[PDB]
Amino acid sequence: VLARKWRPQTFADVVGQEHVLTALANGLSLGRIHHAYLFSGTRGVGKTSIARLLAKGLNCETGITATPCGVCDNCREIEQGRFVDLIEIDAASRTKVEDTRDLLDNVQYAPARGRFKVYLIDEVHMLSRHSFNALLKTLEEPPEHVKFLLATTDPQKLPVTILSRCLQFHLKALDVEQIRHQLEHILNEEHIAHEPRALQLLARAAEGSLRDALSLTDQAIASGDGQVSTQAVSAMLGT
Ligand SMILES: Nc1ncnc2c1ncn2[C@@H]1O[C@H](COP(=O)(O)OP(=O)(O)OP(O)(O)=S)[C@@H](O)[C@H]1O
Ligand SMILES: [Zn+2]
C-alpha cells in the first residue's frame, strides 16, 4: 500500500517535522550522539520513520551521517527490518510480551555488524514496571555501542527518571496543506489521476495523520475507478 511504499528513506523525504530534523541532522553531522532519543507525538506523524532514519544514519557503512546513503548493506537491511543491529521492540504487543521482557533484560553490548547496537522501542510507555527499571538501569550506566530510540504517543505515562535521560523530540500533527501537498506529490509519482478538491478533502479527513491520509487515499483509488476524483471522494467521505 501507499504507506509502506512511501515510507521516508531520507530526512529530506520526511514531511514537516523541521525542528526535529534540523536538530538530529546537526547532531549527526557533528558527531554529537546521545545515548537515548525519545520521539513523541500523535498517530502517523512520523515518529517511527524518523527513529528508523536515525538508526540508518548511525550505522551507514559510509559513516555516521545525517544522509544515509541508502544503498549499503546496513542501509538496505535496516530498510527491510532485517538488520541484526537494529532490534525492534513493541511494548504495545500482547503477543511479544516475553521477548520484550527478555531482550531488555539482556542488552547485547557489542554490535555484531554495524558500529552501534540499536534498540527501537515502540509505545515505550506500555512497558511493564519490571522493564522500565531494566531500561532505566541501562540508561543510567550507558553501554557504549548501544543506542536507545524510544517512541510514544504519551510521554507523560513514562517514569520521569527515564524521560529525563533522553533527548526528547515532540512531533506535531501535520497541517492540512502539509498532508495535501504530500498526497499530490505521491499521486504524481505513481501516475495516478487526481483532482484538487479531492486531495483537499482527503487531507482534511486525515485529521493530522499522514498514515490515515494514505490509507484514505488507497481506499479512494480502489473504490473510485483507479483514480482520486472529487465526486468519488465526497461520496466515500460523506461530504
Ligand atoms: N512526517 C512524515 N513524512 C512523510 N511520510 C510520513 C510522515 N509521517 C507518516 N508518514 C507515512 O505514514 C507511515 C507511518 O508513519 P510512522 O513514522 O510509522 O508514524 P508514527 O508517528 O510512528 O505512528 P504510530 O505507530 O501510529 S504512533 C509511513 O510509512 C509514511 O508513509
Ligand atoms: Zn548506507
UniProtKB/Swiss-Prot annotation:
Belongs to the DnaX/STICHEL family. It comes from Escherichia coli (strain K12). One of its GO terms (molecular function) is ribonucleoside triphosphate phosphatase activity. GO terms for cellular component: DNA polymerase III complex; DNA polymerase III, clamp loader complex; replisome. This is DNA polymerase III subunit tau. ATP binds at G41, T42, R43, G44, V45, G46, K47, T48. Zn(2+) binds at C60, C69, C72, C75. Part of the beta sliding clamp loading complex, which hydrolyzes ATP to load the beta clamp onto primed DNA to form the DNA replication pre-initiation complex. DNA polymerase III is a complex, multichain enzyme responsible for most of the replicative synthesis in bacteria. This DNA polymerase also exhibits 3'-5' exonuclease activity. The gamma complex (gamma(3),delta,delta') is thought to load beta dimers onto DNA by binding ATP which alters the complex's conformation so it can bind beta sliding clamp dimers and open them at one interface. It comes from the Bacteria. One of its GO terms (biological process) is viral translational frameshifting. The keyword Signal does not apply. Keywords: ATP-binding, DNA replication, DNA-directed DNA polymerase, Metal-binding, Nucleotide-binding, Nucleotidyltransferase, Transferase, Zinc. The DNA polymerase III holoenzyme complex contains at least 10 different subunits organized into 3 functionally essential subassemblies: the Pol III core, the beta sliding clamp processivity factor and the clamp-loading complex. The Pol III core (subunits alpha, epsilon and theta) contains the polymerase and the 3'-5' exonuclease proofreading activities. The polymerase is tethered to the template via the dimeric beta sliding clamp processivity factor.
